[PDB]
């Protein structure tokens, strides 16, 4: 594994209106994240890093927050080395910057994309 560190890139952030849907993808480059749990965090305006979701190494066991339970859907695809977060029936309280997190050796965070949600 001739690599330096794991860089996580997010995509799929964008404006949504009412109880809509979205899908955030996190791609990993560097050390293999195939053994490691990859998590989804959020940052509310004026609040710290709330924990949203988690996935296992092979997608066998998923941990979800009690803030969004049954509305969100985390998923993993290890062939393309990506995790996804499907979000359905959104609320304006979900308006946050969503980060992707892995801990292959060292704790590694994403840049975060605006998932601003309109109210209506």
């Amino acid at each position: 594994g001739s690599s330096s560190q794991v860089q996580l890139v997010e995509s799929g952030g964008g404006l949504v209106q009412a109880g809509g849907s979205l899908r955030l993808s996190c791609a990993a480059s560097g050390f293999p994240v195939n053994l490691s749990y990859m998590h989804w965090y959020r940052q509310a305006p004026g609040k710290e890093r709330e924990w949203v979701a988690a996935i296992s190494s092979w997608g066998w066991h998923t941990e979800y927050a009690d803030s969004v339970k049954g509305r969100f859907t985390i998923s993993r695809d290890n062939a393309k080395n990506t995790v996804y977060l499907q979000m359905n029936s959104l609320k304006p309280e979900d308006t946050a910057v969503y980060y992707c997190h892995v801990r292959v050796g060292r704790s590694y965070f994403g840049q975060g994309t605006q998932v601003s949600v309109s109210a209506g």
Partner: protein, 529 residues
């Protein structure tokens, strides 16, 4: 150092490493159960993985490694238990951050496999240390020097538990996410029910210590200067089979006692559950080996020495039936709730008129101590209406059970004196098992006889003996506690004379049977030799 002393030091370091790893695995298991959110059955499976790994390979490793490069295989085993120690701590490194989030007055998910296999790898790790190491020691040592070396090994192996409990208490106070989070943001204390310490640090220290102890074995020379036929020749030897059954009974009594010494102390003398004990055990082990070496005992002499130490141990053990303090007076368990009439039994006792309202729970156990010296089950059953003041059933109250009289606190001090003397005498004959079981069997079967016996001791005396000791202990329980899921829970109070009679009697007759086997085996070796 002339070759064998280097091996003796390296095997001493491996003894420290394996006892340290055992103490670490015992101590960090609460934090492991909290962090991985696994149940009691699963964490018991992870605990028993060491037995599963060890027992299935110990006999074959002991047989086949006696003809190969023995220090190389001991180094391979130390490397293997080091890799297991690293692999146990590897779940922490790539799982992510850890996340955690009654007055009773009278009213009128799959990461544990990396632990599991890792612990199982530790089961394969400790495997070549006792048979191959002790066969290598006593094959090449001077005539009579091997007992002294084994006593030194068993004495210096006690450094391992000291490091184990020291580092467990050191790394339990640290947070599990040390070096990853800002520690001012962490609000919970080590006294909190959601606290998880740095359990991974324990396994990393044990794993790298085992890898360091694996290093000097690859620089040691091989010499300082069929399976079924051999197993049949081992099992048809009557002296060997009688010795294995004999030591199985003795070590079964040892383990079944030592598992519940603290529970017996808690129930009989009321005291809460190795500061001075560890030097006593180390001095006893070294002195037993030194007695064997200096007095130049033969096989019959070593047998008589071990027999005399265990006769003296049971002779001191038999005083435990005379220092029994009286039974606890608990309202609603040994008498009625008012304390005026004794009950026939503890099964579904009637309620009293002092608490006939009874907006309480009988299953709830919060013991309170009255002014008359009688403990009550709960303050709600005690008739206390305010907090405790105005208790109705005290009429013919602090939190906690009543401390007992000084009359049997003196008996408790006698008891811990006899425990100190008993552990000294039991450690005084520790070397004699290995010395006898080498000298009984054929010289090219020294390792296998040390392997299979190590299979019998850890299986039928290590696993089964706490199980049947606890089975006979739990039949003396008075107040049973109902679990949240309604399954098999735990016990709170025991009938103290009944529990004492079962515990000391089972240990005593399990020692008496071993003494009978001693007398028969002494007669057998006197006839044969």
């Amino acid at each position: 150092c002339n070759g064998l002393k280097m091996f003796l030091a390296a095997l001493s370091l491996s003894f420290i490493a394996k006892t340290l790893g055992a103490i670490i695995m015992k101590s960090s298991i609460i934090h492991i159960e909290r962090r991985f959110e696994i149940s009691s059955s699963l964490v018991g499976f992870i605990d028993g993985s060491f037995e599963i790994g060890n027992l299935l390979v110990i006999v074959f490793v002991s047989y086949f490694g006696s003809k190969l490069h023995r220090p190389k295989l001991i180094g391979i085993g130390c490397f293997i238990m080091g890799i297991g120690g690293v692999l146990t701590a590897l779940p922490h490194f790539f799982m992510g951050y850890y996340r955690y989030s009654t007055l009773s007055t009278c009213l009128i998910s799959y990461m544990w496999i990396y632990v599991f296999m890792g612990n199982m790898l530790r089961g394969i790790g400790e495997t070549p240390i006792v048979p191959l190491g002790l066969s290598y020691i006593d094959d090449f040592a001077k005539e009579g020097h091997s007992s002294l070396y084994l006593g030194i090994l068993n004495a210096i192996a006690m450094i391992g538990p000291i490091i184990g409990f020291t580092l467990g208490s050191l790394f339990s106070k640290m947070y599990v996410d040390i070096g990853y989070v800002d520690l001012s943001t962490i609000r919970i204390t080590p006294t909190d029910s959601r606290w998880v310490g740095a359990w991974w640090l324990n396994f990393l220290v044990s794993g790298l210590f085992s890898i360091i102890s694996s290093i000097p074995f690859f620089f040691l020379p091989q010499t300082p200067n069929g399976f079924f036929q051999s197993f049949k020749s081992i099992l048809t030897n009557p002296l060997y089979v009688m010795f294995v059954l004999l030591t199985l009974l003795q070590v079964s009594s040892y383990i079944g006692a030592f598992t519940y010494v603290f529970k017996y102390v808690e129930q009989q003398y009321g005291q809460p559950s190795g500061v001075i004990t560890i030097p006593i055990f180390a001095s006893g082990m070294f002195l037993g080996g030194y007695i064997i070496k200096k007095f130049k005992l033969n096989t019959v002499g070593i047998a008589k020495f071990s027999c005399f130490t265990a006769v003296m141990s049971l002779s001191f053990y038999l005083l435990y039936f005379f220092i029994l303090c009286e039974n606890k007076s608990v309202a609603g368990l040994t008498m009625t709730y008012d304390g005026n009439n004794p009950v026939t039994s503890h099964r579904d006792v009637p309620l009293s008129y002092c608490n006939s309202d009874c907006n309480c729970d009988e299953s709830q156990w919060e013991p309170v101590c009255g002014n008359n010296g009688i403990t009550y089950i709960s303050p709600c059953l005690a008739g206390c209406k305010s907090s405790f003041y105005n208790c109705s059933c005290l009429e013919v109250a602090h939190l906690g059970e009543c401390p007992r009289d000084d009359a049997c606190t003196r008996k408790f001090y006698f008891f811990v004196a006899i425990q100190v003397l008993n552990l000294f005498f039991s450690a005084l004959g520790g070397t004699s098992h290995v010395m006898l079981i080498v000298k009984i069997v054929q010289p090219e079967l020294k390792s296998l006889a040390l392997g299979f016996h190590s299979m019998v001791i850890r299986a039928l005396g290590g696993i089964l003996a706490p199980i049947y000791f606890g089975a006979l202990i739990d039949t003396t329980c008075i107040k049973w506690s109902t679990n949240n899921c309604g399954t098999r829970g735990s016990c709170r109070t025991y009938n103290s004379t009944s529990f004492s009679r079962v515990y000391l009697g089972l240990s005593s007759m399990l020692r008496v049977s071993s003494l009978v086997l001693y007398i028969i085996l002494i007669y057998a070796m006197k006839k044969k030799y």
